[PDB]
Write a protein that holds these residues in place. Structure first.
Motif, short mmCIF file in Angstrom:
data_model
loop_
_atom_site.label_atom_id
_atom_site.label_comp_id
_atom_site.label_asym_id
_atom_site.label_seq_id
_atom_site.Cartn_x
_atom_site.Cartn_y
_atom_site.Cartn_z
N UNK A 71 0.82 -1.26 0.03
CA UNK A 71 0.10 0.02 -0.06
C UNK A 71 0.85 1.22 -0.08
N UNK A 72 1.91 1.17 0.74
CA UNK A 72 2.90 2.33 0.72
C UNK A 72 3.61 2.61 -0.69
N UNK A 73 4.33 1.71 -1.14
CA UNK A 73 4.92 1.63 -2.33
C UNK A 73 3.95 2.15 -3.46
N UNK A 74 2.93 1.37 -3.62
CA UNK A 74 1.88 2.05 -4.78
C UNK A 74 1.39 3.24 -4.43
N UNK A 75 0.98 3.73 -3.34
CA UNK A 75 0.65 4.90 -2.91
C UNK A 75 1.84 5.95 -3.22
N UNK A 76 3.07 5.53 -2.84
CA UNK A 76 4.12 6.62 -3.25
C UNK A 76 4.34 6.94 -4.77
N UNK A 77 3.94 5.78 -5.42
CA UNK A 77 4.35 5.78 -6.86
C UNK A 77 3.52 6.75 -7.57
N UNK A 108 2.41 9.30 -5.83
CA UNK A 108 2.83 10.65 -5.23
C UNK A 108 3.99 11.16 -6.24
N UNK A 109 4.73 10.41 -6.98
CA UNK A 109 5.74 10.83 -7.89
C UNK A 109 5.25 11.07 -8.87
N UNK A 110 4.33 10.62 -9.26
CA UNK A 110 3.79 10.85 -10.69
C UNK A 110 3.06 12.23 -10.83
N UNK A 111 2.24 12.48 -9.46
CA UNK A 111 1.76 13.78 -9.34
C UNK A 111 2.56 14.87 -9.50
N UNK A 112 3.85 14.74 -8.89
CA UNK A 112 4.74 15.82 -8.82
C UNK A 112 5.82 15.57 -10.13
N UNK A 113 5.71 14.57 -10.91
CA UNK A 113 6.70 14.43 -12.22
C UNK A 113 8.09 14.08 -11.87
N UNK A 114 8.51 13.41 -10.87
CA UNK A 114 9.67 12.96 -10.27
C UNK A 114 9.95 11.68 -11.09
N UNK A 115 10.61 11.89 -12.43
CA UNK A 115 10.90 10.91 -13.42
C UNK A 115 12.11 10.02 -13.09
N UNK A 116 12.90 10.51 -12.27
CA UNK A 116 14.11 9.79 -11.63
C UNK A 116 13.41 8.78 -10.69
N UNK A 117 12.82 9.45 -9.73
CA UNK A 117 12.45 8.51 -8.55
C UNK A 117 11.47 7.50 -8.98
N UNK A 118 10.56 7.62 -10.16
CA UNK A 118 9.60 6.81 -10.57
C UNK A 118 10.37 5.47 -10.92
N UNK A 119 11.16 5.78 -12.12
CA UNK A 119 12.16 4.87 -12.67
C UNK A 119 12.52 4.00 -11.96
N UNK A 120 13.26 4.50 -10.83
CA UNK A 120 13.92 3.97 -9.79
C UNK A 120 13.02 2.77 -9.09
N UNK A 121 11.81 2.96 -9.12
CA UNK A 121 10.79 2.23 -8.05
C UNK A 121 10.56 0.91 -8.97
N UNK A 122 10.93 0.75 -10.24
CA UNK A 122 10.75 -0.09 -11.05
C UNK A 122 11.95 -1.25 -10.97
N UNK A 123 11.90 -2.40 -11.24
CA UNK A 123 13.21 -3.36 -11.46
C UNK A 123 13.83 -3.01 -12.66
N UNK A 124 14.95 -3.37 -12.80
CA UNK A 124 15.82 -2.87 -13.90
C UNK A 124 15.24 -3.57 -15.04
N UNK A 125 14.65 -4.76 -14.90
CA UNK A 125 14.17 -5.50 -16.12
C UNK A 125 12.57 -5.53 -15.97
N UNK A 126 11.99 -4.63 -15.56
CA UNK A 126 10.64 -4.45 -15.18
C UNK A 126 9.76 -4.19 -16.43
N UNK A 127 8.66 -4.94 -16.73
CA UNK A 127 7.73 -4.60 -17.84
C UNK A 127 6.54 -3.91 -17.57
N UNK A 128 5.94 -3.11 -18.43
CA UNK A 128 4.94 -2.37 -18.08
C UNK A 128 3.93 -2.58 -19.36
N UNK A 129 2.69 -2.63 -18.98
CA UNK A 129 1.77 -2.81 -19.99
C UNK A 129 0.74 -1.73 -19.64
N UNK A 130 0.76 -0.57 -20.63
CA UNK A 130 0.15 0.73 -20.47
C UNK A 130 -0.28 1.31 -21.91
#
Ligand code: AND
Ligand code: AND
Lengths: 126, 125
Positions: free
Chosen positions: A9-15, A17-39
């Motif tokens: 709940x914390x990590x998802x909610x924080x994620x 929080x980072x999108x709302x303020x546009x912290x691209x670095x911090x968002x990317x860092x939340x992902x695994x290096x080999x993470x996939x996204x379907x969007x």
């Protein structure tokens, strides 16, 4: 060290929080290096922090995108969770709104292994 | 017919909550595919087929209420996700539970798959 239900709940909610303020670095860092996204979910998976990074740069780049949890984060006991949230941006010139739901699975390091965002046009409003 | 469209998915998923809300066990089971597989809560062994699914709902549904807490989110591959809340009495304690259901419909408008995202952190009074 898989995130517990509460940590999810914390990590998802924080994620968000980072999108709302546009912290691209911090968002990317939340992902695994080999993470996939379907969007949007249904689209082909985009793999890797670099590809996921570009993703956010282009979609949040304008700087005027807001995002906020519209409800609690529902979490599982196996490092997974799902959350309801709304995104406000601009569409055709007028300010619109998007309802989205993200399903996320975290690896044993509290990093987003997978992310899936459900939404389509039916979720866009003016 | 093919995969339910985005708008068909929003409708079907809303219909499913109303059947759960009224508790029409039998109508719910008619919504699922013969070989539907259900994971609820997610991270738990799957429930497989009609007979089991029905056994599942009769047990959990047969004083319970369910309502959407926001719009159903639909993609274009017969899938959708929705935020709702279940209301129940757990050993006399009036309780609430926030849940998100992910569903995949088959070429026939039935629920082939369902995952219920929730745990005790989503329980309330
Ligand atoms: C990345 C993000 C917002 C962060 C979510 O987890 C995933 C997502 C879905 C659709 C994107 C949106 C940012 C704003 C975008 C780019 C728009 O303006 C239309 C599509 C929107
Ligand atoms: C099946 C259903 C309600 C229908 C949903 O799609 C899935 C689900 C999640 C948790 C269940 C609930 C019925 C009521 C239950 C069984 C309780 O009383 C505690 C856990 C609850």
């Amino acid at each position: 060290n898989l995130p517990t239900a509460q940590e999810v709940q914390g990590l998802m909610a924080r994620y968000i929080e980072l999108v709302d303020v546009g912290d691209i670095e911090a968002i990317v860092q939340m992902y695994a290096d080999d993470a996939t996204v379907e969007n949007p979910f249904g689209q082909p998976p985009i793999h890797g922090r670099e590809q996921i990074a570009a993703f956010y740069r282009q979609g949040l780049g304008g700087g005027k995108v807001r995002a906020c949890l519209t409800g609690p984060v529902r979490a599982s006991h196996n490092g997974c969770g799902a959350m309801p949230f709304r995104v406000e941006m601009v569409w055709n010139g007028q300010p619109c709104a998007l309802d989205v739901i993200d399903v996320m699975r975290f690896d044993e390091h509290g990093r987003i292994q997978t992310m899936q965002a459900y939404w389509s046009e039916v979720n866009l409003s003016v």
